[PDB]
Amino acid sequence: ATGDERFYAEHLMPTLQGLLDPESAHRLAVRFTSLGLLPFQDSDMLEVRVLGHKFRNPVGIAAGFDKHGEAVDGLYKMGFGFVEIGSVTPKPQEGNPRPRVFRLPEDQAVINRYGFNSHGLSVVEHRLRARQQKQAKLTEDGLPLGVNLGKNKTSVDAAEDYAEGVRVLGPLADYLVVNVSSPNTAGLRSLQGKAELRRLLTKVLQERDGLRRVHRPAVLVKIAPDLTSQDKEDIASVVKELGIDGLIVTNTTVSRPAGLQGALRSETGGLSGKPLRDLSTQTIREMYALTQGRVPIIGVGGVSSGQDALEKIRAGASLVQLYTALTFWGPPVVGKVKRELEALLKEQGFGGVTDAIGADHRR
Numbered sequence: 001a002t003g004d005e006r007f008y009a010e011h012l013m014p015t016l017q018g019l020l021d022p023e024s025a026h027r028l029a030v031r032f033t034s035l036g037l038l039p040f041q042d043s044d045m046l047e048v049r050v051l052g053h054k055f056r057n058p059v060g061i062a063a064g065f066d067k068h069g070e071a072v073d074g075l076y077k078m079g080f081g082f083v084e085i086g087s088v089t090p091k092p093q094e095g096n097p098r099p100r101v102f103r104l105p106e107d108q109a110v111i112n113r114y115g116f117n118s119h120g121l122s123v124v125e126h127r128l129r130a131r132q133q134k135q136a137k138l139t140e141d142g143l144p145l146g147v148n149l150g151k152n153k154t155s156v157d158a159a160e161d162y163a164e165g166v167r168v169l170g171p172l173a174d175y176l177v178v179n180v181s182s183p184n185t186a187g188l189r190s191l192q193g194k195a196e197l198r199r200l201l202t203k204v205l206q207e208r209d210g211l212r213r214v215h216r217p218a219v220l221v222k223i224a225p226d227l228t229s230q231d232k233e234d235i236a237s238v239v240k241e242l243g244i245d246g247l248i249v250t251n252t253t254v255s256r257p258a259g260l261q262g263a264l265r266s267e268t269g270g271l272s273g274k275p276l277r278d279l280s281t282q283t284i285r286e287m288y289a290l291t292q293g294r295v296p297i298i299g300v301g302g303v304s305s306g307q308d309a310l311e312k313i314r315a316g317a318s319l320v321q322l323y324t325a326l327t328f329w330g331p332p333v334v335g336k337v338k339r340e341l342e343a344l345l346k347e348q349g350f351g352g353v354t355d356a357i358g359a360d361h362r363r
């Protein structure tokens with residue numbers, strides 16, 4: 001309940017929404033963040049050790065905000081415990097024609113169909129190289145960096161696209177994400193099927209294992225919220241079989257939950273924000289159980305509060321991410337989630353975040 005929190009949520013963000021279309025607002029958000037034009041101290045309680053790293057707090061920025069790696073340091077300054085950039089495709093590509101981003105203010109939601117607009121691996125590679133040693137120190141300080149990998153629209157061999165991403169950006173990342181769950185690239189989600197996924201992930205892991213030790217990232221798979229029970233079983237099996245390091249749960253949904261009020265609810269694309277929240281949480285809950293709690297989960301979808309974050313943690317997430325909440329609360333949402341999360345942990349008798357991970361499954 002800070003002053004900045006209310007000001008941003010009641011006055012500044014509604015005004016910015018009134019003046020700028022969603023994509024323009026996105027571009028401005030990236031610009032301001034990259035320039036440090038931004039408005040809470042992390043306690044030991046919020047520290048998490050997973051994926052071979054220390055995370056000083058469990059609240060990350062989800063993929064899709066900083067697609068091209070332009071605002072990484074600004075995002076740490078915003079208070080995120082870790083930053084994920086991407087998705088990045090091998091070659092540059094423009095993505096879908098505009099308009100391709102839509103606000104649903106009545107639903108605290110967004111729909112997007114960007115279609116992997118990407119500066120490409122080479123540009124992002126040089127952008128990260130320019131701050132590689134700074135990042136090494138941040139990572140050692142408990143502020144890790146993730147790189148989310150996509151594939152080009154016209155690509156003939158999906159596995160080769162991801163392999164290229166591993167080779168080029170793997171050495172610059174604490175973890176990589178095989179994003180096989182964007183709803184805006186034709187045929188992409190079918191790579192979530194068992195046979196396809198096993199081949200794909202085998203190639204990715206081999207390429208990863210071929211990197212020098214200090215440049216060898218964890219590999220996670222990011223999945224949709226729209227999977228069948230069969231799909232989820234298959235993914236859990238393959239992940240355990242191959243020793244995948246973790247899961248990101250979830251991407252946006254192509255479903256349209258009953259009760260959406262936004263005028264733009266029937267736009268094509270992935271839906272994010274509050275209407276996704278519990279769908280995402282239940283997918284975390286299921287994947288945690290299917291993997292016996294032995295596979296770290298980063299929980300994502302509709303987080304805007306400590307309660308939202310804690311529900312995903314108790315469902316099985318070791319870390320969480322948010323993105324869409326920024327549209328409505330702005331940068332203060334990060335400190336807000338961290339403060340509320342700490343208070344709830346104390347209130348529910350947890351020694352820290354680590355004690356709460358998967359707690360719903362143990363009672």
Ligand SMILES: Cc1cc2nc3c(=O)[nH]c(=O)nc-3n(C[C@H](O)[C@H](O)[C@H](O)COP(=O)(O)O)c2cc1C
Pocket residue numbers: 062063064065067086087101110112114116148179182222250251252272273274276300301302303321322323324325
């Ligand atoms: C505009 C927009 C762009 C996104 N781009 C990507 C992306 O490139 N790669 C990816 O894995 N997820 C992408 N996402 C999904 C987010 O990373 C996240 O999984 C999802 O939005 C749910 O979290 P949220 O409700 O807090 O926004 C994007 C989401 C939005 C809203």
Ligand SMILES: CC(C)[C@H]1CC(=O)c2nnn(-c3cc(F)c(-c4cccc(N(C)C)c4)c(F)c3)c2C1
Pocket residue numbers: 012016017021022023025026028029030032033037038039101102103110323324326327328330331
């Ligand atoms: C989800 C994404 C596609 C869009 C969707 C959308 O419709 C939207 N509308 N506004 N907005 C947005 C604009 C912003 F300028 C910042 C921002 C960032 C950093 C600093 C500041 N300030 C100093 C005030 C502001 C922000 F966090 C979010 C978004 C994000």
Ligand SMILES: CCCCCCCCCCCC[N+](C)(C)[O-]
Pocket residue numbers: 105106107108257258274275276278279
């Ligand atoms: C300012 C708008 C705030 C809207 C907050 C939404 C609260 C949760 C309701 C969405 C639930 C979607 N569903 C059916 C999939 O659970």
Ligand SMILES: O=C(O)c1cc(=O)[nH]c(=O)[nH]1
Pocket residue numbers: 064087112113114115116117179181182183184251252270271
């Ligand atoms: O680039 C996009 O359209 C996109 C990619 C992704 O993984 N998720 C999403 O909602 N959009």
